[PDB]
Design a protein around this nucleic acid. Structure first.
Length: 117
RNA sequence: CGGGCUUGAGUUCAGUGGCGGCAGGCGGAAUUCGUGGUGUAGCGGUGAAAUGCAUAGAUAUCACGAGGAACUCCGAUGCG
């Protein structure tokens, strides 16, 4: 039981190891999602623009045939491929409205986990 | 030993300044846990992997709730 009428929000959660693209309606209810690991890029190449393009194309094709036409992009986390995903969901029928970087930064919060040697 | 002086020293008055100390209040970002909604094939991690968590419903996303800790930019100087 979902209902996405005309416009929605795309969420990209990237990191140094993987990228997850998830499209949702105005109430943040996900209708489709994809990732490099889902596409089958289990390697160091999970953080590749090609993998991001493949995942974004799959997600956009899966979600376009549901009434989704316009989307607003939110991006969290670093990593190559966010631009590729944005371009792919822009060119796969879905029209982008704005690009918003919601990457969370701390105002000196909790302690980071040590340092690798 | 006795007397004198104002430069040392101290007291007063004024100006200016500070992450200087102790104590009480208040705040936002982030993180963790629980509850509910959407959704399903993976997430996480490495030089590469596995252990680990997941169809008895994870990662992701939205809302409600709870608690602890530290204070981005200013910001390299200043105080003791």
């Amino acid at each position: 039981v979902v209902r996405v009428e005309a416009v929605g929000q795309a969420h990209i959660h990237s990191s140094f190891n993987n990228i997850i693209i998830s499209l949702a309606n105005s109430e943040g209810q996900v209708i489709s999602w994809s990732s490099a690991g889902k596409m089958g890029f289990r390697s160091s190449k999970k953080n590749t623009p090609y993998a991001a393009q493949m995942a974004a194309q799959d997600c956009a094709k899966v979600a376009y045939d549901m009434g989704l036409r316009k989307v607003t992009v939110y991006v969290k986390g670093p990593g190559n491929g966010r631009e590729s995903a944005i371009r792919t969901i822009h060119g796969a029928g879905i029209e982008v409205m704005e690009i918003i970087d919601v990457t969370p930064m701390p105002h000196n919060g909790c302690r980071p986990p040590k340092k690798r040697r």
